[model samples]
Target: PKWERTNLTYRIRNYTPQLSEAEVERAIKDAFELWSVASPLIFTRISQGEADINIAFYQRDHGDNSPFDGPNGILAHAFQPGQGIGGDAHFDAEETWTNTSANYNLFLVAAHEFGHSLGLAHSSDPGALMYPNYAFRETSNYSLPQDDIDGIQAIYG
Candidate 1:
């Protein structure tokens, strides 16, 4: 089923892939789905999903004003709800994103990104998905802590 928000209409875009395309998309959808469970937001998929929220994966200096850097720098980012580029999501394709037990859990990172996409800022709570730092935990150990939920719901609830 598609996700829905009482105040807004939204949809996810079909992205141009770089790495882990299928897994990234799935994890991203999963991340958004997780949030939808907390609020009345309806998330849908549009082959041409446009700016309501465009999720794209790219690499360093990809031009878009937001050039991605490798290593411990920002893993991914998202714009707030608005027109044009606003509400779009981007990932650093140069980073080693893995869905296995021994890599940077792509799902967790996507969840963190969606937090920002939903207008959630960084959190002081270490357990929160929007926590400023990246601890690089395994996938099985990854899950959105309550503070993360509280933060997103505060904005979109």
Candidate 2:
């Protein structure tokens, strides 16, 4: 499952209070670009309009029916490729989302969710970006692991 086109667009509908908009914007942008390094995909940000992907930060019941749990659980979730909800990412606003590697790294989480947004699934390999578990990985100039690179390439390359 892949998007019909490569030039995908996204909208940051809301953000977590813990992180500044500037930090959130960069973290989100970098997340998108991190995947771009692995395939033909390119992401564009739209401030006030509908987009292919709509990023949000909502805690508990926020209209999607799948209410996010308490502060430390279910950091985020996303849908696979498609129309409205497809490719959209919903972040649990309950967590203290951070830029640094303090459990919930915003960049890594967003990048991983975006992988799902682009048709990626949970991988068995611990070294994969699509790996379901969210533990700290070095975020300095982060890059996609070969397992994930090979994965998206298989779909969109």
Candidate 3:
């Protein structure tokens, strides 16, 4: 079953030194905010304690069977809704995660990964945020693509 709850909590267990703590926090918060606005959901952040979603940064063979490749091969991955390990997001520390319009934008990638966390799958539309591969886009004026909004609304609307 999908997440029947309206409110969800998430926590960042560790921050990547590549970006400032505030940058990472804001990126994650903004990512969740996108989904919240598209559906009947609310995301809350916690300092310490168990949350529905757990986020972290790791490199090669971190622990989960799906290990992150260095730098550009694979940016990050997340799980679908469920118990432990589920709804968790892990980023590859090898990549330079920038909050600005750089190589890889943390806000965009995190927003995409969180879509998986909320049980949304990749969209065929390349312009969609939930598209499988990473594509550069100006996050400064980002909005949920119609494809992504429709996908999530299908499950959570």
Q: Which residue runs of candidate 1 sit more than 4 Å off their true CA positions?
A: 1-21, 49-51, 136-143
| Residue 76 of model 3, lDDT score | 89
- How badly does each model clash, as a count of residue pairs? 7, 0, 0
TM-score of 1: 0.80
Q: What is the TM-score of each predicted model, taking all chains together? A: 0.80, 0.96, 0.96
Pick by TM-score: 1 or 3, better one: 3
Lowest summed lDDT over 10 consecutive residues: which window, candidate 2?
132-141
What's model 3's overall lDDT? 0.89
Clashing pairs in 3: none
In model 3, the worst 10-residue window by lDDT is: 1-10
lDDT of 3 by residue, 59-98 (tens): 9998889888796888989999998998899999899889
The residue pairs that clash in candidate 2, if any, are none
Distance from true location, Cα of 152 in model 3, Å? 0.8
